[PDB]
Design a protein around this ligand. Structure first.
Ligand code: NVP
Lengths: 410, 543
RNA sequence: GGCCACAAUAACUAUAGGCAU
DNA sequence: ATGCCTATAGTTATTGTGGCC
């Protein structure tokens, strides 16, 4: 066992418990009763002031209710243990592959026990209907799911068991993050399923126990300008305003020649022909949009920021950036056509899509900017949440200028 | 060796120690009576005599205010107060009052030395007899926390033996309710009394049991219904300044049961800040909604208990400007709980958007009390609902809602055109104002040749751009094309303003309903666009 | 006077736009 | 760059109702 010490000056997490539905409350008790008998969680008295938020999520593969505990408040204080004391190495050749398979390894953490002094900080309260019961309390005796300090201690044992796997396959690069395992293979799709099955069979030999992503298909889609045979005043006025907002992002684009076409007061119905200078500049601006802009670099010291915008009619776009008006990775997700789609579900699946891509390329949880209320989001996010890792999100205003620009992206 | 029910270890804060305050001056008249109290508690096993080994001192009033600051933080006793509307209907309800509650549950040996108090001397400043609390003291922060946790362990096997009965604990009082007959219910309480007697808890007999009408949190409780206590208000003259706010608080407490409660006009009088005795006179608009509120208070009404088999139904009504009231009910006419949404931060919130914000308030409240999402009934059409949110930036989702028409129907005023109108007159909108002396100009230049320039006194830059749109729509035909340069003016026309603010915008809104088609476009300011530069030179001629 | 639950009212920070120097 | 305006998010301080020490 290893003693865990907190950051000096800072006290333990104290967050108010968010209420859950009647179906979710009874689902949490069933899991907590089974874990108590095995030796995973134990009851504590009212002397404990530390509280941890707890939610309920549904599974697709195991079709059962799973317990989700948010450690976002604790992770800000326990960042010294998982980075300074015991850091996780990240390879550069992880983002460049053919197929990435995601496997859950969160069940393996229930074997290694937690420190005696740290047990009191992992206490959580279960919400009740109309506050009939005072609140049943449980503390983690082993490594909890969703905590960044769990893989740091398990790292010494994880490297030993993956040692014969890494020796057999030198070209295949493996990476561990939180509770999800990411394996990148350069083999064929028919051979990719065989390699994962051999790795999964090795886990059963130790003791503890289709979803696929394409890292090569995350190519940056260029923003193309609408092609029109006859340009009207109304079409120009919208074109100048959109490209002027993007002038701070792209220095190459100039709106000097476009404004000189209009002389004096004119109606929008009137058709204005483009000159030789106007046709040359507009065609040159498309080349700057296709070619990646100079000045894009990754910096691990600065925090990653992500902003998702609503477009309408089942269209969503996101921008990943470290500095304002300086994009690093751009992409868009339309609609999950097949069964059922709504305003929350299309946004919940969007956040999970960026988070998974953020781990493979970089390896950090970004700040998600959502066009939704705090009271609305913190109630319906649990219904479609599947991933055990919970990123930090903030709620801000969505400008009309950013909405009308990224709609032309192919 | 003396204390039962296994003591829970309690420690102080590492930052500072316990109290060190000296004893208060002598009274003599009150000390003599306290001697008999301390002797009686010593024989039972509550306090014990100690020597000069204890340095800690506690003043006798006994105040524990200094001790609570030194004591560590405990987890809250109650998470949200239970509402009578969300409770289950029971056939027979019996309450049990615990005698010697904190006297039974003891304190840990390590913490016993910190709760030591000194009795005031008789004469000549004598040391007297020192005493320390062995059990839970009266007025301690951790007293309601440990007692509730200890009672849960006592009633832990009792709940498993009888799943049909529902028992609730509140500080000292315990509520027992079941759907069983009066004969079977009386036997269960007698068995419950013997379970508590084993630890050392005093319970009243059958003759000392309280009647079905209960008084809890200001609510009158009944086995089949529930009602609020009648509020008596003075009906003669409006007194002082704070009593006006007291009437709002009385209406706030009445909002949970009475559906017809208006508070918007009363809050308008409380706009005056920094006042001890202001004395606000009554006005026509403020007393207008106050008269109808008193009429509903005259008739007594009762609420209904929650039933798990039936689904919850909610309906939204509009009673005033920027105010929404809702009622939750399972059966018609019989209401469970009523609510309100009256807060306006200042700017426009939109009637369709604020309605959705009101629904979210019900949804979140339904999770805490009921535990399930209710079926909503909105006064808005399905066609209007789909048009608003698809063009708006913010996303929201309502799972189950049905279309039911109500007498106060809410309808959309106007919608902006996506495509420009052919053969219509083009209007260019641009305005400028100065910070000094507060002066601004508004004008518009058309393709025909007509123009009008006016001067305004005491105005900001945001208002001068707003005034130019009003003048452009005033001297125009039916189909109007508006080209604006400001981003601020673009957001107001796209949304629907309906509040105390935006009085100047209300003149524009009224005109927009009269016109058939109105187009709006945005252009960048100060660049060199034909039509925008001509208006810019006129407004900045004197500024 | 502090603590707990819920409400109404005033102030302060991030984003977007604007004015003035 | 700072001071001064508006809007979209959030936060706090104040008062009130119901209780408690
Ligand atoms: C004060 C109180 C606290 C907690 N629950 C209840 C009540 N009491 C009610 O009076 C009560 C009355 C009638 C039916 N259920 C009730 N109830 C579920 C047990 C009723």
């Amino acid at each position: 066992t290893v003693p865990v010490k907190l950051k000096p000056g800072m006290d333990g997490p104290k967050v108010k418990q968010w209420p859950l539905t009647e179906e979710k409350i009874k689902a949490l008790v069933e899991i907590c009763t089974e874990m108590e008998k095995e030796g995973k969680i134990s009851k504590i008295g009212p002397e404990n002031p530390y509280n941890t938020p707890v939610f309920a999520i549904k599974k697709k593969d195991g079709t059962k209710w799973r317990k989700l505990v948010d450690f976002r408040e604790l992770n800000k204080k326990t960042q010294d243990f998982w980075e300074v004391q015991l850091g996780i190495p990240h390879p550069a050749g992880l983002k460049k592959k053919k197929s990435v398979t995601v496997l859950d390894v969160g069940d393996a953490y229930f074997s290694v026990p937690l420190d005696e002094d740290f047990r009191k900080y992992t206490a959580f309260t279960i919400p009740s209907i109309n506050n009939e019961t005072p609140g049943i309390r449980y503390q983690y005796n082993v490594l909890p799911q969703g905590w960044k300090g769990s893989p740091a201690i398990f790292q010494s044992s994880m490297t030993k068991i993956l040692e014969p796997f890494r020796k057999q396959n030198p070209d295949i690069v493996i990476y561990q993050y939180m509770d999800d395992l990411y394996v990148g293979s350069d083999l064929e799709i028919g051979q990719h399923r065989t390699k994962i099955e051999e790795l999964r069979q090795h886990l059963l030999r130790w003791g503890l126990t289709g979803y696929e992503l394409h890292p090569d298909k995350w190519t940056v889609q260029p923003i193309v300008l609408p092609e029109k045979d006859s340009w009207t005043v109304n079409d120009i006025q919208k074109l100048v305003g959109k490209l002027n907002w993007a002038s701070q992002i792209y220095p190459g684009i100039k709106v000097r020649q476009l404004c000189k076409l209009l002389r004096g007061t004119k109606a929008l119905t009137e058709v204005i022909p483009l000159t030789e200078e106007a046709e040359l500049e507009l065609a040159e601006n498309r080349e700057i949009l296709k070619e990646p802009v100079h000045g894009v670099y990754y910096d691990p010291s600065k925090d990653l920021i992500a902003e998702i915008q609503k477009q309408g009619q089942g269209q969503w776009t996101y921008q990943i950036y470290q500095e304002p008006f300086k994009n690093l990775k751009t992409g868009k997700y339309a609609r999950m056509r097949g069964a059922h789609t709504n305003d929350v579900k299309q946004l919940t699946e969007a956040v999970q899509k960026i988070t998974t891509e953020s781990i493979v390329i970089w390896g950090k949880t970004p700040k998600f900017k959502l066009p939704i209320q705090k009271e609305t989001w913190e109630t319906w996010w649990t219904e479609y949440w599947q991933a055990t890792w919970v990123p930090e999100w903030e709620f801000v205003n969505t400008p009309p200028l950013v909405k009308l620009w990224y709609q032309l992206e192919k | 060796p003396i204390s039962p029910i296994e003591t829970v270890p309690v420690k102080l804060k590492p930052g500072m120690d316990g109290p060190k305050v000296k004893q208060w001056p002598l009274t003599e008249e009150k000390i003599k009576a306290l001697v008999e109290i301390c002797t009686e508690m010593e024989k039972e096993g509550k306090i014990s005599k100690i020597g000069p080994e204890n340095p800690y001192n506690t003043p006798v009033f006994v105040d524990f205010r200094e001790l609570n600051k030194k004591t560590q933080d405990f987890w809250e006793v109650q998470l949200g107060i239970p509402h009578p509307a969300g409770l289950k209907k029971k056939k027979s309800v019996t309450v049990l009052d615990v005698g010697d509650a904190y006297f039974s549950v003891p304190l840990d040996e390590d913490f016993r030395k910190y709760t030591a108090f000194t009795i005031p001397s008789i004469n000549n400043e004598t040391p007297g007899i020192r005493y320390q609390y062995n059990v839970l003291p009266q007025g301690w922060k951790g007293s309601p926390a440990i007692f509730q946790s200890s009672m849960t362990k006592i009633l832990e096997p009792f709940r498993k033996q009888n799943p049909d009965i529902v028992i609730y604990q509140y500080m000292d009082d315990l509520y027992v309710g079941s759907d069983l007959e009066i004969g079977q219910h009386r036997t269960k309480i007698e068995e419950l009394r013997q379970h508590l007697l084993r630890w050392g808890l005093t319970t009243p007999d059958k003759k000392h049991q309280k009647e079905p009408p209960f008084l809890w949190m200001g609510y009158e409780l009944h086995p089949d219904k529930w009602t609020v206590q009648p509020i008596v208000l003075p009906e003669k003259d409006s007194w002082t300044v704070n009593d006006i706010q007291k009437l709002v608080g009385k209406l706030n407490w009445a909002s949970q049961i009475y559906p017809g409660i208006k508070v918007r006009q009363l809050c308008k009088l409380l706009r005056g800040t920094k006042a001890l005795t202001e004395v606000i006179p009554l006005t026509e608009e403020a007393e207008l909604e106050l008269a109808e509120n008193r009429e509903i208070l005259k008739e007594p009404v009762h609420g209904v208990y929650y039933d798990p088999s039936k689904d919850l139904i909610a309906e939204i009504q509009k009673q005033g400007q920027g105010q929404w009231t809702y009622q939750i009910y399972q059966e018609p006419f019989k209401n469970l709980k009523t609510g309100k949404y009256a807060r306006m931060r200042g700017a426009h919130t939109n009637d369709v958007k604020q309605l959705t914000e009101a629904v979210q308030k019900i949804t979140t409240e339904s999770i805490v009390i009921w535990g399930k999402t209710p079926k909503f009934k909105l006064p808005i059409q399905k066609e209007t609902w789909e048009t608003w949110w698809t063009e708006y930036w913010q996303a929201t989702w309502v799972p189950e809602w049905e279309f039911v028409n109500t007498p106060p129907l809410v309808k959309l005023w106007y919608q902006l055109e996506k495509e420009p109108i052919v053969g219509a007159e083009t209007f260019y909108v641009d305005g400028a104002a100065s910070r000094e002396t507060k002066l601004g100009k508004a004008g518009y230049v058309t393709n025909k040749g007509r123009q009008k320039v006016v001067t305004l006194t005491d105005t900001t830059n945001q208002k001068t751009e707003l005034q130019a749109i009003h003048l452009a729509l005033q001297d125009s035909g039916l189909e109007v094309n508006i080209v604006t340069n400001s981003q601020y003016a673009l957001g107001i026309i796209q949304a629907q303003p309906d509040q105390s603010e935006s009085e100047l915008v209300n003149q524009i809104i009224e005109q927009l309903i009269k016109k058939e088609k109105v187009y709006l476009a945005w252009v960048p300011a100060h660049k060199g666009i034909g039509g925008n530069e001509q208006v810019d030179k006129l407004v900045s001629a004197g500024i």
